[PDB]
Amino acid sequence: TTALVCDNGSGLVKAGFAGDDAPRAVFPSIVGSYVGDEAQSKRGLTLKYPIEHGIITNWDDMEKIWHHTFYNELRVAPEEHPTLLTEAPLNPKANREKMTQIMFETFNVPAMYVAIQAVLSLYASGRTTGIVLDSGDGVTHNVPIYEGYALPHAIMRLDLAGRDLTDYLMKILTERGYSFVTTAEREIVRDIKEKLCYVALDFENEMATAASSSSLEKSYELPDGQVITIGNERFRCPETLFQPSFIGMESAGIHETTYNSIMKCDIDIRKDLYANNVMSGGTTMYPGIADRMQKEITALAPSTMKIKIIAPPERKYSVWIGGSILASLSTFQQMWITKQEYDEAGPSIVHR
């Protein structure tokens, strides 16, 4: 009896077996019906994302994603495997119940559990108190956590994440005459972003370096032989995280949302939050982002405050890894919701 961990994101499903060090299955959270990699290759049906900004919004398509996960990706019988799922911070109660109902009634799992994504990322770093910045394809959150409890008044949601950065790179690539328009082309630009982009330690100074020579330029070649060369676009793209005005958003940037979130917590915990800033999710992978965040938070915090940013190399899968850890601890085993409990009490048991 081996537990499964399924971490459902706006852009990517990460799934696998509890006890493994990484998800074996990672695929696009897309329904075209076709699911995942199948759907993109056969773009031609239309593509829908059943999770928007971290929240499940299309339950029929979400069910196809879970089915594809169990049967085609992991090749398991779900009725034999306790299953740990993940949810966004502030996921409405109704959504949690419906996830529980689908798992027990449609997939017949013997047991299940739903954990908050940011909390899992904190656990993966060995911590039970800290503040997580979780930034994926569709949403970014700041989640302060006290001994495993996400502090609900201090959680911040920011609708600025990887897909917005990809779209912004598509826009600014036109300055050099390049044209990427198609959804297929968006996938190309996504990969360019991932390969060439970085966070400047100081933006204004980096802009000056980029204007004064070509030393910051890098190139990416498409299969047809087109060479895409960019300079300041490399760091302007993720700068958006720190300056959302780049894409017409009024919001504060991620450094400030981190600070604001800490400031909505009791003063007596702020020290431990400042010293345990954990970075999670694919959009935190930009080289230089940890050092920039350290600098920005330092500029916002009390002058004597010890500031520490933890950015693990595995952080594209930290949520998933935290679930894998949690689900295989002997001390967690009594916390599964069992099919017997669901059978007697129904969906609302999940809030227990």
Partner: peptide
């Protein structure tokens, strides 16, 4: 308590290095 045992296990889990290599 229940939670202190889980919390302690999380602190001493050793992270991904103690999980199975895929």
């Amino acid at each position: 308590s229940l939670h202190s045992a889980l919390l302690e296990a999380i602190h001493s889990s050793g992270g991904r290095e103690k999980l199975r290599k895929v």
